[PDB]
Amino acid sequence: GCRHVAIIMDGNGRWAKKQGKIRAFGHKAGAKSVRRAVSFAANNGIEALTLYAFSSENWNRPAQEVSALMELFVWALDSEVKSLHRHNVRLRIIGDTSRFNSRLQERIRKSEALTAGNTGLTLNIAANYGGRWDIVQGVRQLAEKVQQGNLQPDQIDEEMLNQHVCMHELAPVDLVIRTGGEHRISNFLLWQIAYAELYFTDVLWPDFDEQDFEGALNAFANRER
């Protein structure tokens, strides 16, 4: 009965160091773990899977290192989205994409447009995203309508604001998984997780596998509302 899972994927760096390897090694292993989790979600009837890529916090890196990184993101979308499309996955990026360079904004738009008509798993990647920022964008949209004279303050209720927060057209989030050992939401989704099962595990992201995922789904199944 679990329809939408969200994941905070911590642990890549510690995993690499524990293995006597550099951080990049842990990132490559982390991406394999993403592919594995997405296949698992799709193979088991989960309708939406939302992954926390990163907040809008500045990167502790040189402008050239950042520009290089953004092109690597362009390359990953170019290399892998066609397979996701054949697998009937709808890819959506949620978050402040205006902070990206123009080229990456366009490639995200193209990847979204290519898969928008798909009816399988909806994979949401939350990039330059924050739960409070998400709610604020919705509030700003409602405030504009009040300024126009198209909405009265007293008409704003939970349902109206819900229609203006990310993913409101998808199944509500049922389960949030955070790997890496910390017990916090860290301003990932906020509005959307009001009734979600929260599952914390010490397993590091690159090691998180199908057995770990099923364990989280079992926690959800054993909930008592």
Ligand X SMILES: CC(C)(C)CC(C)(C)c1ccc(OCCOCCOCCOCCOCCOCCOCCOCCOCCOCCO)cc1
> Least Å distance between CB 174 and Mg ion?
12
Is position 124 annotated as part of the catalytic site? no
Our CA angle for 114, 205, 17, nearest 5°, is 125
With CB under 6 A as the contact rule, the residue among 5, 8, 16, 42 that binds ligand X is 42
With CB under 8 A as the contact rule, the residue among 167, 193, 204, 217 that binds a copy of itself is 193
Say if residue 27 carries a ligand binding annotation: yes
Strand-pairing partners, residue 200, are 178
Check the CA dihedral 23-28-34-40 and report its sign.
Answer: negative
Our CA angle for 206, 208, 214, nearest 5°, is 160
Is position 10 annotated as part of the catalytic site? yes
Out of a copy of itself, Mg ion, ligand X, none, which partner does residue 147 contact, by CB within 5 to 8 A per kind?
A: a copy of itself
Q: Find all residues with CB under 8 Å of 102, minimum gap 6, and list them.
A: none
| Token digits of residue 125 | 């990647």
Instruction: Kindly state whether residue 223 participates in binding a copy of itself, applying the rule CB under 8 A.
Output: yes
**Residue 138 amino acid letter:** G
- Indicate which residue of 58, 60, 157, 222 is catalytic: 58
With CB under 8 A as the contact rule, the residue among 136, 150, 171, 214 that binds a copy of itself is 136
Instruction: Kindly state whether residue 16 participates in binding ligand X, applying the rule CB under 6 A.
Output: no
End-to-end CA distance of the chain: 13
**Cβ pair 81, 109 in contact under 8 A:** no
| Token digits of residue 106 | 């366009």
Q: Indicate the residue among 32 and 184 with the shorter CB distance to a copy of itself.
A: 184
- Binding segment toward ligand X, per CB under 6 A, in 15-23, 25-33, 164-172, 211-219: 25-33
Out of Mg ion, ligand X, a copy of itself, none, which partner does residue 185 contact, by CB within 5 to 8 A per kind?
A: a copy of itself
Q: Indicate the residue among 42 and 204 with the shorter CB distance to a copy of itself.
A: 204
With CB under 6 A as the contact rule, the residue among 24, 66, 68, 76 that binds ligand X is 76
Instruction: Kindly state whether residue 147 participates in binding a copy of itself, applying the rule CB under 8 A.
Output: yes
Question: How many helices and strands, by DSSP H and E, does the chain display?
Answer: 7, 6
Instruction: Kindly state whether residue 225 participates in binding Mg ion, applying the rule CB under 5 A.
Output: no
Question: Cα torsion for 189, 55, 215, 35, to the nearest 10°?
Answer: 120
Say if residue 13 carries a ligand binding annotation: yes
User: Given strand 197-200, what is the order of strands in its sheet?
Assistant: 90-94, 122-127, 48-54, 4-9, 175-179, 197-200
Which residues bind to Mg ion, rule: CB under 5 A?
183, 219
Annotated binding-site members: 10-15, 23, 27, 55-57, 59, 61, 178, 183-186, 197
Catalytic residue ranges: 10, 58
